[PDB]
Design a protein around this ligand. Sequence first.
Ligand SMILES: *[C@@H]1O[C@H](CO)[C@@H](O[C@@H]2O[C@H](CO)[C@@H](O[C@@H]3O[C@H](CO)[C@@H](O)[C@H](O)[C@@H]3O)[C@H](O)[C@H]2NC(C)=O)[C@H](O)[C@H]1NC(C)=O
Ligand SMILES: *[C@@H]1O[C@H](CO)[C@@H](O)[C@H](O)[C@H]1NC(C)=O
Ligand SMILES: *[C@H]1O[C@H](CO)[C@@H](O)[C@H](O)[C@@H]1O
Ligand SMILES: *[C@H]1O[C@H](CO)[C@@H](O)[C@H](O)[C@@H]1O
Ligand SMILES: *[C@H]1O[C@H](CO)[C@@H](O)[C@H](O)[C@@H]1O
Ligand SMILES: *[C@H]1O[C@H](CO)[C@@H](O)[C@H](O)[C@@H]1O
Ligand SMILES: *[C@H]1O[C@H](CO)[C@@H](O)[C@H](O)[C@@H]1O
Ligand SMILES: *[C@H]1O[C@H](CO)[C@@H](O)[C@H](O)[C@@H]1O
Ligand SMILES: *[C@H]1O[C@H](CO)[C@@H](O)[C@H](O)[C@@H]1O
Ligand SMILES: *[C@H]1O[C@H](CO)[C@@H](O)[C@H](O)[C@@H]1O
Ligand SMILES: *[C@H]1O[C@H](CO)[C@@H](O)[C@H](O)[C@@H]1O
Ligand SMILES: [Ca+2]
Ligand SMILES: [Ca+2]
Ligand SMILES: [Ca+2]
Ligand SMILES: [Ca+2]
Ligand SMILES: [Ca+2]
Ligand SMILES: [Ca+2]
Ligand SMILES: [Ca+2]
Ligand SMILES: [Ca+2]
Ligand SMILES: [Ca+2]
Ligand SMILES: [Ca+2]
Ligand SMILES: [Ca+2]
Ligand SMILES: [Ca+2]
Ligand SMILES: [Ca+2]
Ligand SMILES: [Ca+2]
Ligand SMILES: [Ca+2]
Ligand SMILES: [Ca+2]
Ligand SMILES: [Ca+2]
Ligand SMILES: [Ca+2]
Ligand SMILES: [Ca+2]
Ligand SMILES: [Ca+2]
Ligand SMILES: [Ca+2]
Ligand SMILES: [Ca+2]
Ligand SMILES: [Ca+2]
Ligand SMILES: [Ca+2]
Lengths: 539, 539
Amino acid sequence: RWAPIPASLMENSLGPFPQHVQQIQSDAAQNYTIFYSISGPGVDKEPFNLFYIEKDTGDIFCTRSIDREKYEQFALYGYATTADGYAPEYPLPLIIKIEDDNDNAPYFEHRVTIFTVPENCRSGTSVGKVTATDLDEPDTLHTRLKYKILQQIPDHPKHFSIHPDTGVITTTTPFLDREKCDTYQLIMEVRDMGGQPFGLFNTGTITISLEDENDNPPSFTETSYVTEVEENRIDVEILRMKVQDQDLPNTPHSKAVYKILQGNENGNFIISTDPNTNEGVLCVVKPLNYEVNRQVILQVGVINEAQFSKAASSQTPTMCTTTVTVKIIDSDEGPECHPPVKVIQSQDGFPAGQELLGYKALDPEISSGEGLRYQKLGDEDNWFEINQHTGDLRTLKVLDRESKFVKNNQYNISVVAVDAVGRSCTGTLVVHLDDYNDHAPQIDKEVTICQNNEDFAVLKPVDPDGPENGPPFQFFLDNSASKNWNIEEKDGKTAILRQRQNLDYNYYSVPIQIKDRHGLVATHMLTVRVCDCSTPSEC
Amino acid sequence: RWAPIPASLMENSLGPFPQHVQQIQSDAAQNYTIFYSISGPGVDKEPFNLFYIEKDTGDIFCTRSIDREKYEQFALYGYATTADGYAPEYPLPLIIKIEDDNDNAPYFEHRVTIFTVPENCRSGTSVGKVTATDLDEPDTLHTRLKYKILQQIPDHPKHFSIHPDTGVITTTTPFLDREKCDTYQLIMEVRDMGGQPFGLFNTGTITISLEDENDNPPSFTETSYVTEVEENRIDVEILRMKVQDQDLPNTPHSKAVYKILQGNENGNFIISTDPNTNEGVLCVVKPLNYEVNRQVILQVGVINEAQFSKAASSQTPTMCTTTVTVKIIDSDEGPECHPPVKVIQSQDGFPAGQELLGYKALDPEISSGEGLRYQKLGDEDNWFEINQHTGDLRTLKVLDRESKFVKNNQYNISVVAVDAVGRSCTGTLVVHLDDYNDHAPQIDKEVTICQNNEDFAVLKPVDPDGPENGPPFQFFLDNSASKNWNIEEKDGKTAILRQRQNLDYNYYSVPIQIKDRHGLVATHMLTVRVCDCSTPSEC
Ligand SMILES: *[C@@H]1O[C@H](CO)[C@@H](O[C@@H]2O[C@H](CO)[C@@H](O[C@@H]3O[C@H](CO)[C@@H](O)[C@H](O)[C@@H]3O)[C@H](O)[C@H]2NC(C)=O)[C@H](O)[C@H]1NC(C)=O
Ligand SMILES: *[C@@H]1O[C@H](CO)[C@@H](O)[C@H](O)[C@H]1NC(C)=O
Ligand SMILES: *[C@H]1O[C@H](CO)[C@@H](O)[C@H](O)[C@@H]1O
Ligand SMILES: *[C@H]1O[C@H](CO)[C@@H](O)[C@H](O)[C@@H]1O
Ligand SMILES: *[C@H]1O[C@H](CO)[C@@H](O)[C@H](O)[C@@H]1O
Ligand SMILES: *[C@H]1O[C@H](CO)[C@@H](O)[C@H](O)[C@@H]1O
Ligand SMILES: *[C@H]1O[C@H](CO)[C@@H](O)[C@H](O)[C@@H]1O
Ligand SMILES: *[C@H]1O[C@H](CO)[C@@H](O)[C@H](O)[C@@H]1O
Ligand SMILES: *[C@H]1O[C@H](CO)[C@@H](O)[C@H](O)[C@@H]1O
Ligand SMILES: *[C@H]1O[C@H](CO)[C@@H](O)[C@H](O)[C@@H]1O
Ligand SMILES: *[C@H]1O[C@H](CO)[C@@H](O)[C@H](O)[C@@H]1O
Ligand SMILES: [Ca+2]
Ligand SMILES: [Ca+2]
Ligand SMILES: [Ca+2]
Ligand SMILES: [Ca+2]
Ligand SMILES: [Ca+2]
Ligand SMILES: [Ca+2]
Ligand SMILES: [Ca+2]
Ligand SMILES: [Ca+2]
Ligand SMILES: [Ca+2]
Ligand SMILES: [Ca+2]
Ligand SMILES: [Ca+2]
Ligand SMILES: [Ca+2]
Ligand SMILES: [Ca+2]
Ligand SMILES: [Ca+2]
Ligand SMILES: [Ca+2]
Ligand SMILES: [Ca+2]
Ligand SMILES: [Ca+2]
Ligand SMILES: [Ca+2]
Ligand SMILES: [Ca+2]
Ligand SMILES: [Ca+2]
Ligand SMILES: [Ca+2]
Ligand SMILES: [Ca+2]
Ligand SMILES: [Ca+2]
Ligand SMILES: [Ca+2]
């Protein structure tokens, strides 16, 4: 079957109705009469009675106006029957095609649309795309939409340009900046018919608001800073420096972050950020001493939580920094005494009535150290006497390491220094005595031996001198015990009193001399007890 | 077969070519491949390659612009065959109908055309009809013509009016006159599109020339005429009168015809029309006699060869006529003599030397008959002698009816009258004389009779007088022969000489008297001889 050739009706005909469409006719109309009849969606179906046919002339007619956008075409059947109801001709499948006119204006899905763009973006940066629906016959001039910007606000300079065919808005300058203007509005138009002035149209708004980029570093209020704090302070804020950021406030592009760049090596200072005011609070956390440093110079800088961009302040070093000089003020302190211990050395044979360098107390204000009233405290055998105005020492006794108040060969005396108000230090003074051979080997003199269980005694000398000036000892007999006693010296620190087999139960006496390593003699009278004991207790 | 549904093309398509017309498609295409092809006057016939079909898509296209006025529609055949040569479809009869736009202006067949009408016609008289060719599609606005006169010249009054739809020119007044205006021009316009101002148009001329009708009778130059001709003249023109006709000259409406209305009863005059000058020649054909009438007065009229019309001077009495007075002149004539014979009566016994009224000779100039010199000619026995002046008779001899110069009782004598110049007539005078009884019956005297074969004779008298003064006669005897002779009168002119038986052979003498009807006696002596003869000569 061949496709039917379509007759065409223009939508929105006003009249006069009934309006004429086409004329169907059959050649078999000769010889005998024929009754023309019609049927299809449009006559005996929905929509009803849109068409009808003159029973004789075969002329088709139209009873009402048609909206192409509701009905695009009608597929009908043409008939040729006769009064008797005979049917010479098969039915004619015809179609009536509804043609389109520009009876619809293109409109915008939404009155006002938003787009957003990052500031400082490249020109030709495409920002977005608009689309308008036009219900006319598609892919025809009646539907060919053309876009263009009707007006921009602020009016100049124009930063936007829309491609008329696609509807893409794009940028025209690279100089978009949120800090100069944060939002632009464009009034738009859609004209069908290819944009020719007899086209149908509507307008709409399209607001463009810029998204912020951190293209501005923060900057301090004043060009440079100065302040004051007292020495030996802690947990106190020195100053508050405020800052300016030209970007979006209360955001990582706005919030500041300070850093002490140079000057804070020891850790004396710390800086932090008041979160409610975004200023930098400078505090003292470890104390300063006026005497060591009178002036500290800090260089503090500021940065944003989030990073910098735009490539004008990014390649180049643009953290803005100011130099804050913190002055420390003087407090007149009591006296200090470091190290907590001084030490001086001397010979053990050091004479009395001598002057010796004692504890030096350094006054912090003036290094001369005068104006102080020293004072001894912990002196046992009173070896010393202090100079009240210079803290020097005067020997009273002859010094002597072998004193029963000499542990480790040292003597302890503590001194209290006092200033002209009531403040006081304390120092400890160690007296390290070097040794001299001023003693000789000493021993006990009450010897004791049993009879049938010992033929000897063991006698043990002790040189109170130092290990260098002590043993090895040398033991001599006096010949008072000529050939009734004898002594032998195996080691250099022990000796054994060998009696001879000529003994009585009595108290004999044997004089014995003993020598130190150098040759200092002592003489010792031993009273030996000769008991018939067993153990060294039964006597 | 159902009639094909036509797809439509606008003539004068600008483009863009190739342009899409319609799309042929076959249902049997889902089964196996089909290659579409078309053919008809428009593809492989004339005009060639205007159309073509995409073999697969079935779209028909058009390659060039079409002039509907060259080709009103194209009847094509669409074919759907396959590579294998199968043919699902019989060929599809298509027709591509070319639509018309108003691209032709209606024009006039001839720049200037002529029509003609007779003058003095009724208003609404149809003069002619114009037709313009417009090659556009008939029965549409593109050809719906409206006609109109743009200008008529002479400008006023407008005598013509054209019907805007049909193109028939008509008259508007009845006052058309060729003698006032012979020709009109109409400047015309034809506007298609129903004469609406955006219609196409052209102009033309239409000359109207009036046909002449005889609406003017001819009229004489002079108000009246006078002239002179000679008495007793023949075959000569008396005068030439010219005439005026304001109609079409040298035509049956101009050429004249004269007729004598009154005055020419006897037939003296005849008039005719000179064909070379159209004037009237008045002639004499029977002669005039000055003495009878000195002046004749004629009534002449003139009319046109062709009859009069318009029914204002044709229905109404308008033959113009003039009175011609023709003067007759006197001619000095010879003498005339009518009747050519006179007759006069008299007694036969009329005396000599007597005067009698004779022949009258009429001189025409003066009726006195004087100035005339008469003269006798034919008088035999000289009965008369004529008077030379006037026409009298003088008896010379005594008159006598029984004269031997008188036949039938009349006497002829001719007289010639002569005037004082030399002209002469001739006349005869018959003299019928009355009878008198002056003679008596006379007879011979020589009788003849025989004896034995005759007893009587026969004698016959003759009275020279008239039958009235003659017989019947009466015969008397003198009684000289007492009883020897006797006569009897049977008839009125008979006589028989009866002798008696007492007779002897001798020569007797018998007196016989005889009288006429009235009683005049004569005596005659007969010498009668009676011999014994036999025949009428031998004695
Ligand atoms: C006389 O005064 C001096 C003052 O220093 C005493 O000598 C000091 O002895 C102390 C205790 O032995 C030493 O203290 C240190 O202690 C830590 C742990 O507590 C240990 O790790 C160290 O090795 C050291 O022993 C101190 O260094 C030492 N000072 C000096 C200058 O020698 C001395 O003991 C005093 N005399 C008497 C009789 O107490
Ligand atoms: C219809 O009538 C015509 C008369 O000219 C005739 O030729 C034709 O055959 C008729 N129709 C049929 C189907 O025979
Ligand atoms: C520019 O950018 C917008 C959003 O990225 C697009 O919609 C447009 O087509 C062009 O790429
Ligand atoms: C675009 O402009 C028209 C002006 O004709 C407005 O009516 C419309 O609302 C939109 O602003
Ligand atoms: C688009 O929307 C704006 C409001 O944002 C209107 O002012 C404008 O006329 C258009 O309707
Ligand atoms: C300084 O320091 C000592 C302890 O080392 C105290 O005993 C003295 O009284 C002073 O306060
Ligand atoms: C009037 O009559 C003329 C003939 O005199 C026609 O030619 C014209 O068409 C109209 O009928
Ligand atoms: C009819 O009249 C017009 C005047 O507009 C002429 O131009 C034309 O030639 C025709 O004579
Ligand atoms: C008819 O003819 C005359 C000239 O004879 C033109 O003047 C007129 O315009 C029309 O062509
Ligand atoms: C009168 O006279 C003429 C001559 O003058 C004759 O010819 C005529 O016959 C008549 O006698
Ligand atoms: C009488 O007779 C004569 C001749 O005698 C004629 O000549 C004349 O005319 C008249 O008749
Ligand atoms: Ca619609
Ligand atoms: Ca549209
Ligand atoms: Ca539409
Ligand atoms: Ca920026
Ligand atoms: Ca920014
Ligand atoms: Ca910032
Ligand atoms: Ca200090
Ligand atoms: Ca200080
Ligand atoms: Ca101080
Ligand atoms: Ca010592
Ligand atoms: Ca020692
Ligand atoms: Ca020693
Ligand atoms: Ca054309
Ligand atoms: Ca046309
Ligand atoms: Ca036209
Ligand atoms: Ca006239
Ligand atoms: Ca005339
Ligand atoms: Ca005339
Ligand atoms: Ca005369
Ligand atoms: Ca005369
Ligand atoms: Ca005369
Ligand atoms: Ca006589
Ligand atoms: Ca007589
Ligand atoms: Ca007589």
